[PDB]
Design a protein around this ligand. Structure first.
Ligand SMILES: Cc1cc2nc3c(=O)[nH]c(=O)nc-3n(C[C@H](O)[C@H](O)[C@H](O)COP(=O)(O)O)c2cc1C
Ligand code: SF4
Ligand code: SF4
Ligand code: SF4
Ligand code: SF4
Ligand code: FES
Ligand code: FES
Ligand SMILES: [Zn+2]
Lengths: 56, 192, 119, 434, 79, 244, 95, 62
C-alpha cells in the first residue's frame, strides 16, 4: 500500500530507494518535476508476481 | 533584516541612474591617484564609503554599479565587497544613524541597558527609519577598551559627503540618549 | 580470429559473429574520485530494445543486454583482447583518454600584473 | 635590574604625549624630538638599520611576537622589477584594545617617521597605512599629519633631502575584524574581500599586488625611529633577555582606574595592576580571572596570576599569550561562562567564513556555550567542547580559528567545576519541578 | 562451535547399528536436546543491543535517520 | 605503481625533478607540483572538495590535510608545494582525525534531503563521508537555511546544500569568462549568488552542474527524472558543432 | 590439529614439487598445486597418519576471465580425526 | 473527493504562521512517523514550501 499524508499529499518522494533495494526487481518507478516543482512519481507499479514479500 | 540579496524596489533598482557629483569627482580622482592605474580595484572601499556618504548613509544598487564602472570591474565584485563589510548599509538608514548595542568587553560595565529606552522613545524597530526620516538604530562596532560602557555612535548623513561625521559618545545615560537625540532633532551637535 | 573456444563454449553461432568494442570506461564528470578506473570492458553494442505495450517496461531480445556491464570485466586491455580473440568476436579497441598533470601552484593566483602601461 | 623587572622613569618612556596634553602636529613633534636628524639615519644604509633592529631584539607588538629585525631581513635585497611595499597594520579590532588609536591620535609623526625608517630598512618604495574604518577622526588627523609631512619635504621624492623616494598612503577598512590579519589585510587593500590567504606563499615573496611586502604593527613601526636614535643597548636593557623593550598596556575591566600605560616588558601582572591602576575592585581577594592579552589569548586563573611576568615567553609557558597586552580583569561578581559565551559569539560574528572548521566550528562552539550558560547540557558535553576545540585548532587557514578555540579551552582547563556545578543545579531544579 | 553454543549444555546422540531405526531414534533425541538448548537460551538471554554498532555495515534507527545527517547518509548508502 | 586515473606526468627536463616520500615510496615529480599532485603520482588519492585540476587553487574545505614531518600542524596538500626530501603521511592518525573533524563540520548544517537530492547516488559529500568520515553525529542544535534563487532555465538551485567550496565562482571567473557569480556575505551566513536577479547567460554555464560536488547546483531539465545507477553510460562524441 | 601445526607439518612432509603456493591464515590454510599433481596430493593427504583427511566436503569452480588459466577448481577437505579443514586449489582453462 | 489530485489537496492547506525566520518541518506530530527533519528559511514574501510534505510556511510578523 502507498500511504499519503493526513493533508492528502502522497508521501512518496520518488527517491527510488525502494527500487534499488528490491531483491526481486519487482518495482518500476518513473518520476519528474510536478507543476509545483515537487519531486513526485508519475508511474509507480509493483509486480506482485515477482514480489517475494520480504519487506525490504 | 540584513539580506545577502537584492529585491527590486521603487527606492533602489539598477534602472535608476547614479553619477557621483560635480564636487565629488575631485575626491574620486584623489582616491584613484593613490594606487597604480592597473590596480584601480584597490580603491573600491574608499569609493563605496564616499557613495554611502553622498547618497545619504546607504548604498543603492545603482551606486555599486557606478563604482564598478569607475574602477572598471564586474559589478559582482563590488557587491561582494559591499556585502562583506559591516560599515556599508544596503538598506535605507535614517539621516542620523545611531549605533547602540554593545559588545563583549563593554557589557561587563553595563552596555546592554541602552537600546530599549531609545527604541521605545522613537517608536520604530531597529533598522526602521522614523516617519520624518531623521533617526535609525543599528549595532555598533565597539572601538576601544570601553572604560565607559554606555557608548553610542552617531553617524551623520545630513549634509552628505561634506558634513558626514562619525562620533563616539562616552558614558551616556539611558535618558541622556534621549537628551542627545532631542538635541540632534533641532540641529545642534552635542560634544564628546 | 581463432574462435575455437567460441565453438566449444555453447554460444549459438548467431551470437558468435557479433562486433564488440573493447574500451576502458572513463571517470564520471560529477565525481572527483578515481576508484572505478583501470578496468576494461567489452561493449556488445546491445541497443535493440523497445517498450512493452502493457506497462511501458523495456523489453529486449538480446541475451548480451547487460553481460559486459554486470559480470564481464577485465583488468587489462590484453586480457579483453585475448577473450574476444578466443570467442571469435570481431573487436575494436578504444584507447582511454588520460589526464595530464600540469604544474599548478597557489602563488599563481597572486601574480604581479606589471608596471602600469599607458598604451 | 634583572631581579626587579619593572618601573620606567618618565625620561625612559618612548611614547611621550600619550595622554594628549601637547600639540600632536608637526610643531609638537619637532619640539618633542620627532623627525630629528632623520637624514642621517636613512643615509647610513639599509643593512645598518636591520643590524640595529636585530641587536635591539624588538619582537613584534601585534601579538605574534616575531622578532622585527629578522622579519625585515626577509625582504629582497636586489629588485627584480617588482617594487617592495611596507604595510602598517593600524586596523585594530580586538575587543578592549586602545593602543594604536591613542598612538595615531596623539603621535602621528612618530608613525610617519617609523614608516620612512622601516621603508628604508626594507628597500620599500611606498607605504600603505591601513587604518580601521571606524577611526574616522584618527584617519583625518593622520591625513593632516601626512599633508604637513609632505609640505615640509619629510616625505615624497627625496625624503628628508636624502635621495630616498618614499610615498606614504592611507588606506582604511570598512569594519571587519578579520582584516587585521596579515594576508586578509592585503586582500582588503587589493580591493577584494578580506579573506586570509594560505601561508606557503609568504608576504615577503608574494604580498601586495603580487610584489614582496611586509606587514607590521603600528607600535613596532612607531618605536623604530627612536630605537636607532637612542640606541639599541638602551632599548635592550628593559625586560628579560629574549623579549625586551617597553610595551603599551590598555588595562581595563574590574580595576579601580583603568588606563593605558607604558611599562617595562617584564612588569609583574600583580604589580602592574596594583601600582599604576588601583587595586582590583574589592581587593586582590575579589579577583577571579584575568585575560592577559585580550580576546585571542586564553584565560589565566587567580592561583597562577600570582608571580606571573607579562612576557611573550612567560605567559606562553603558562599556556596563555601576551597578545596585544590588553588585560581584562574579572571579579567573582561576574559569570565566567557568560563571558566565554560572549567571546564565542564575537568570534562567530567576525569569522570570514572561508574555511570549513572556522565557518561552522565557531557557530557550534557558540551554541554549546549558550546551552551551558544556563546549565542546559549534560556532564559529557564538556568533553565534546574539548573535542570540537581540538578539531578547530590547527586545521584553519588563519589564526582566528585558534583564537576562537583558545577561550573555551581556557574555561574548561581552569573552571570545569563551575560548569559542572551549574549543570548539576539545573538538573536538580528540573528533577524537583516535575 | 559458533555463536554461544559453547556456553550451553547439550548431549550428542550417537547410533550403534546405522540402520533407519537408529536414524529415527537420533532424530528424536536431537529434538529433545534442542528443547533443552531452547530452555537454556531463554533463561540466560541477556539485555543489550541486537546489532553491531558499526553503522557502516548495519542500518540506522528510523528515528536517527530522520534526525541526523550522517545516519541518513548511512541509510541511503546501505539501501 | 601507477598514478591515480592513469595520469601522465610531463617532465620538461630530467634535471628539474625533485624526490618525495608519499608513504615511504620514492616518487619523482617536477618542481612546481603540490603535495596532492605528488600523492596522485604515487597512487594515493587524497580527499578533496574545493580543489579542481582545471580551476585555481583555493584551500577552503580543509579536507586534503595531510601530515608532514617538518610541520607542527597539518598542511593543505592541494596548495602546499612539494619540496625535495619531504616525507608526506596520509594514513596516519593525525590526517585521519583531521578528515573526520572536517567531515563532521561539513555535515553539520547540511540538510537531511538525500532522498530528494538529484545528487543522490553520485555525491562526493556522502561518498567521502562513508569512506573518510566518522559514524555518529554529535550535532543536535538547529541547522541554518537559505532561500533558493533563480539562475535561469538550465541550472536548478538549492543552496541549502551548498558546502561553500567556491568552485562555481572560480569557474565563472576563469573558465566561463562571465563574472556574474560570487560569494556574498561573511561568516556562516555567506551565500553564493549573483546579487541582482540575473540568469547565467554563458554558453558554458551548464558546466557548473558538474563542478559542484553536491546537489546545490543541478540540471533543471534533468530534475528528478532518474538516478545515476539506472543509467547506461555510452562514450560517444559530439555533432552539434565541428569541435567534436 | 590446527592451522599452525598442519602448515608446518605439510611444509616438511609433503614433496616440494607438488605444492607451489601455501597460505596460512584464519580464513583457511590453502594449497595450490599443478593439475598433474592433484590426485597424488589428495591420495597422500587421505592416507597419511598425521593428516588423515577422509571427507571431501565439496568441489567448486571459480571463473576468472582475466587469467590465462581461466577456471579455479577448489577442493574443500575435512579431517574428522584431527578436527581440521584443508583447502586445495588448482587452475585449468576450457580445453 | 477522489476528483481532487494530491497537488490540489496540498494547494488548499493554508500556510502555517511562524514568528521566527526559520521553522523545522518534520511532517507529523510524532517525529519518528514523518519525514526527515527539514529546516525552512522564511526570508521571502511568498510562502516557503517543504520539499517533503508540500506544506507551506509563511513568516508571521516581519
Ligand atoms: C584575526 C586576526 C586579527 C589580527 N588583528 C591584528 C591587529 O589588529 N593589529 C595587528 O598589529 N596585528 C593583528 N593580527 C596579527 C597579524 O598577523 C599581524 O599583522 C602580524 O602579527 C604582524 O605583527 P607585528 O607588526 O607585531 O610583527 C591579527 C591576526 C589575526 C589572526
Ligand atoms: S520511491 Fe520508494 S522508497 Fe522512495 S519515497 Fe517512494 S515509496 Fe518510499
Ligand atoms: S579561520 Fe575563520 S577567519 Fe580564518 S580564514 Fe578560516 S573562516 Fe576565515
Ligand atoms: S548534496 Fe549529497 S549529501 Fe547533500 S542531500 Fe544531496 S546527496 Fe545528500
Ligand atoms: S554552489 Fe556548489 S560549486 Fe558553488 S560553492 Fe556551493 S557547493 Fe561549491
Ligand atoms: S559598548 Fe559600544 S563602544 Fe563599548
Ligand atoms: S581540497 Fe585542499 S583544502 Fe580543499
Ligand atoms: Zn515537512
Amino acid at each position: 500500500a502507498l500511504r499519503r499524508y493526513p493533508t492528502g499529499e502522497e508521501r512518496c518522494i520518488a527517491c527510488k530507494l525502494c527500487e534499488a533495494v528490491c531483491p526481486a526487481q519487482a518495482i518500476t518507478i518513473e518520476a519528474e518535476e510536478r507543476e509545483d516543482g515537487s519531486r513526485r512519481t508519475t508511474r509507480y507499479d509493483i509486480d506482485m508476481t515477482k514480489c517475494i514479500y520480504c519487506g525490504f | 533584516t540584513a539580506l545577502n540579496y537584492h529585491l527590486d524596489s521603487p527606492d533602489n533598482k539598477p534602472d535608476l541612474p547614479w553619477e557621483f557629483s560635480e564636487a565629488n569627482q575631485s575626491k574620486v580622482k584623489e582616491i584613484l591617484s593613490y594606487y597604480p592605474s592597473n590596480y584601480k580595484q584597490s580603491a573600491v572601499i574608499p569609493l563605496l564609503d564616499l557613495a554611502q556618504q553622498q547618497n545619504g548613509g546607504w548604498l543603492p544598487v545603482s551606486a555599486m554599479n557606478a563604482v564598478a564602472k569607475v574602477i572598471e570591474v564586474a559589478p559582482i565584485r563590488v557587491y561582494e565587497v559591499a556585502t562583506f563589510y559591516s560599515m556599508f548599509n544596503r538598506a535605507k538608514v535614517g539621516k542620523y544613524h545611531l549605533l547602540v548595542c554593545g559588545t563583549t568587553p563593554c557589557m561587563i560595565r553595563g552596555s546592554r541597558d541602552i537600546e530599549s529606552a531609545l527604541l521605545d522613545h522613537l517608536g520604530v524597530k531597529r533598522g526602521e527609519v522614523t516617519k520624518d526620516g531623521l533617526f535609525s538604530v543599528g549595532e555598533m562596532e565597539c572601538m576601544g577598551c570601553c572604560v565607559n560602557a554606555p557608548m553610542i555612535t552617531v553617524a551623520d548623513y545630513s549634509n552628505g559627503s561634506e558634513g558626514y561625521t562619525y562620533n563616539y559618545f562616552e558614558d551616556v545615560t539611558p535618558e541622556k540618549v534621549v537628551e542627545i537625540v532631542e538635541k540632534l532633532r533641532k540641529g545642534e551637535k552635542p560634544p564628546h | 580470429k581463432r574462435g575455437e573456444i567460441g565453438k566449444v563454449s555453447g554460444i549459438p553461432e548467431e551470437h558468435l559473429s557479433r562486433k564488440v568494442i573493447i574500451y576502458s570506461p572513463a571517470r564520471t564528470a560529477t565525481q572527483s574520485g578515481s576508484g572505478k578506473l583501470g578496468k576494461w570492458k567489452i561493449n556488445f553494442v546491445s541497443t535493440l530494445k523497445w517498450e512493452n505495450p502493457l506497462m511501458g517496461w523495456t523489453s529486449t531480445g538480446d541475451p548480451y543486454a547487460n553481460v559486459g556491464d554486470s559480470a564481464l570485466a577485465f583488468d587489462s586491455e590484453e586480457a579483453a583482447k585475448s577473450f574476444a580473440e578466443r570467442h571469435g568476436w570481431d573487436y575494436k579497441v578504444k584507447k582511454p583518454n588520460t589526464p595530464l598533470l600540469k604544474v599548478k601552484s597557489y602563488s599563481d593566483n597572486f601574480k604581479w600584473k606589471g608596471n602600469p602601461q599607458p598604451e | 635590574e634583572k631581579t626587579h623587572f619593572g618601573g620606567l622613569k618618565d625620561e625612559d618612556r618612548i611614547f611621550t604625549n600619550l595622554y594628549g596634553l601637547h600639540d600632536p602636529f608637526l610643531k609638537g613633534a619637532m619640539k618633542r624630538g620627532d623627525w630629528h636628524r632623520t637624514k642621517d639615519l636613512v643615509l647610513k644604509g639599509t643593512d645598518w638599520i636591520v643590524n640595529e633592529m636585530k641587536k635591539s631584539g624588538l619582537r613584534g607588538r601585534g601579538g605574534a611576537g616575531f622578532p622585527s629585525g629578522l622579519k625585515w631581513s626577509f625582504m629582497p635585497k636586489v629588485s627584480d622589477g617588482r617594487p617592495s611595499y611596507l604595510v602598517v597594520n593600524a586596523d585594530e579590532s580586538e575587543p578592549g584594545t586602545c593602543k594604536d588609536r591613542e598612538i595615531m591620535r596623539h603621535d602621528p609623526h612618530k608613525l610617519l617617521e617609523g614608516c620612512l625608517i622601516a621603508g628604508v630598512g626594507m628597500r620599500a618604495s611606498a607605504a600603505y597605512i591601513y587604518i580601521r574604518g571606524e577611526y574616522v577622526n584618527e584617519r583625518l588627523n593622520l591625513e593632516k599629519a601626512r599633508r604637513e609631512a609632505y609640505a615640509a619635504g619629510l616625505l615624497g621624492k627625496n625624503a628628508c633631502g636624502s635621495g630616498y623616494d618614499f610615498e606614504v598612503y592611507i588606506h582604511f577598512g570598512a569594519g571587519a575584524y578579520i582584516c587585521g590579519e596579515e594576508t586578509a589585510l592585503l586582500e582588503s587593500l587589493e580591493g577584494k574581500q578580506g579573506k586570509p590567504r594560505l601561508k606557503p606563499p609568504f608576504p615577503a615573496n608574494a604580498g601586495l599586488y603580487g610584489c614582496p611586502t611586509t606587514v607590521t604593527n603600528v607600535e613596532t613601526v612607531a618605536v623604530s625611529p627612536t630605537i636607532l636614535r637612542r640606541g639599541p643597548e638602551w632599548f635592550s636593557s628593559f625586560g628579560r633577555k629574549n623579549n625586551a623593550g617597553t610595551k603599551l598596556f590598555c588595562i581595563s575591566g574590574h580595576v579601580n582606574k583603568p588606563c593605558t600605560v607604558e611599562e617595562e616588558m617584564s612588569i609583574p601582572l600583580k604589580e602592574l595592576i596594583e601600582r599604576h591602576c588601583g587595586g582590583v575592585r574589592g581587593g586582590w581577594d575579589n579577583l577571579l580571572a584575568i585575560i592577559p592579552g585580550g580576546s585571542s589569548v586564553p584565560l589565566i586563573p587567580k592561583n597562577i596570576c600570582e608571580d606571573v611576568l607579562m612576557d611573550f615567553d612567560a605567559l606562553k609557558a603558562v599556556q596563555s599569550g601576551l597578545g596585544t597586552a590588553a588585560v581584562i580583569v574579572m571579579d567573582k561578581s561576574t559569570d565566567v561562562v557568560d563571558a566565554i559565551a560572549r567571546l564565542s559569539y564575537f568570534y562567530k560574528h567576525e569569522s570570514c567564513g572561508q574555511c570549513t572548521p572556522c565557518r561552522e566550528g565557531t557557530g557550534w562552539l557558540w551554541m554549546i556555550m549558550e546551552r551551558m550558560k544556563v546549565g542546559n547540557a549534560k556532564l559529557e558535553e564538556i568533553d565534546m567542547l574539548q573535542e570540537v576545540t581540538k578539531q578547530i585548532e590547527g586545521h584553519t587557514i588563519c589564526a582566528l580559528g585558534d583564537a576562537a578555540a583558545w577561550p573555551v579551552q581556557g574555561l574548561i582547563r581552569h573552571f570545569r567545576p563551575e560548569l559542572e556545578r551549574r549543570i548539576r543545579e539545573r538538573a536538580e531544579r528540573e528533577l524537583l519541578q516535575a | 562451535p559458533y555463536d554461544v553454543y559453547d556456553q550451553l549444555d547439550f548431549d550428542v546422540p550417537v547410533g550403534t547399528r546405522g540402520d533407519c531405526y537408529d536414524r529415527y531414534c537420533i532424530r528424536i533425541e536431537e529434538m529433545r536436546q534442542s528443547l533443552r538448548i531452547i530452555v537454556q537460551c531463554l533463561n540466560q538471554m541477556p539485555s543489550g543491543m541486537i546489532k553491531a554498532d558499526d553503522r557502516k555495515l548495519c542500518p540506522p534507527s528510523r528515528c536517527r535517520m530522520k534526525l541526523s545527517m550522517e545516519s541518513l547518509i548511512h541509510h541511503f548508502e546501505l539501501y | 605503481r601507477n598514478p591515480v586515473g592513469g595520469a601522465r606526468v610531463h617532465f620538461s627536463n630530467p634535471e628539474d625533478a625533485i624526490e618525495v616520500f608519499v608513504d615511504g615510496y620514492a616518487v619523482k615529480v617536477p618542481k612546481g607540483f603540490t603535495v596532492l599532485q605528488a600523492c596522485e603520482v604515487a597512487g594515493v588519492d587524497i580527499p578533496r572538495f574545493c580543489y579542481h585540476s582545471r580551476l585555481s587553487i583555493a584551500g577552503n574545505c580543509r579536507m586534503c590535510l595531510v601530515e608532514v614531518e617538518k610541520s607542527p600542524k597539518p598542511v593543505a596538500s592541494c596548495a602546499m608545494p612539494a619540496l625535495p626530501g619531504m616525507k608526506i603521511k596520509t594514513d596516519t592518525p593525525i590526517a585521519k582525525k583531521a578528515r573526520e573533524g572536517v567531515m563532521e563540520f561539513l555535515l553539520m548544517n547540511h540538510p537531511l534531503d538525500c532522498p530528494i537530492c538529484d545528487q543522490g547516488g553520485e555525491c562526493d559529500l556522502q561518498d567521502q563521508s562513508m569512506a573518510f568520515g566518522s559514524d555518529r553525529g554529535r550535532f543536535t542544535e538547529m541547522k541554518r537555511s537559505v532561500v533558493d534563487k533563480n539562475l535561469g532555465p538550465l541550472v536548478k538551485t538549492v543552496m541549502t546544500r551548498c558546502i561553500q567550496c567556491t568552485r562555481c565562482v572560480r569557474f565563472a571567473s576563469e573558465v566561463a569568462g562571465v563574472q556574474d557569480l560570487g560569494i556574498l556575505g561573511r561568516g556562516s551566513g555567506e551565500e553564493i549568488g549573483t546579487y541582482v536577479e540575473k540568469l547565467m547567460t554563458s554558453e558554458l554555464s551548464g558546466n557548473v552542474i558538474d563542478i559542484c560536488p553536491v546537489g546545490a547546483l543541478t540540471s533543471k531539465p534533468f530534475a528528478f527524472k532518474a538516478r545515476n545507477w539506472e543509467l547506461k553510460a555510452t562514450e560517444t562524441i559530439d555533432v552539434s558543432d565541428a569541435v567534436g | 590439529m590446527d592451522n599452525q601445526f598442519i602448515f608446518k607439518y605439510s611444509w616438511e612432509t609433503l614433496p616440494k614439487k607438488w605444492v607451489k603456493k601455501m597460505e596460512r591464515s584464519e580464513h583457511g590454510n590453502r594449497f595450490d598445486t599443478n593439475t598433474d599433481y592433484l590426485f597424488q596430493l589428495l591420495c597422500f593427504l587421505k592416507l597419511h597418519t598425521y593428516t588423515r583427511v577422509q571427507v571431501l566436503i565439496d568441489i567448486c569452480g571459480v571463473d576468472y576471465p582475466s587469467r590465462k588459466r581461466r577456471f579455479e577448481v577448489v577442493y574443500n577437505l575435512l579431517s574428522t580425526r584431527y578436527n581440521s579443514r584443508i583447502r586445495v586449489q588448482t587452475s585449468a582453462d576450457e580445453v | 473527493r477522489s476528483k481532487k489530485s494530491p497537488m490540489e489537496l496540498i494547494s488548499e492547506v493554508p500556510p502555517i504562521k511562524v514568528d521566527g525566520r526559520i521553522v523545522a518541518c518534520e511532517g507529523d506530530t510524532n517525529p519518528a512517523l514523518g519525514h526527515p527533519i527539514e529546516f525552512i528559511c522564511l526570508d521571502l514574501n511568498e510562502p516557503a514550501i517543504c520539499k517533503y510534505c508540500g506544506l507551506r510556511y509563511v513568516q508571521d510578523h516581519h
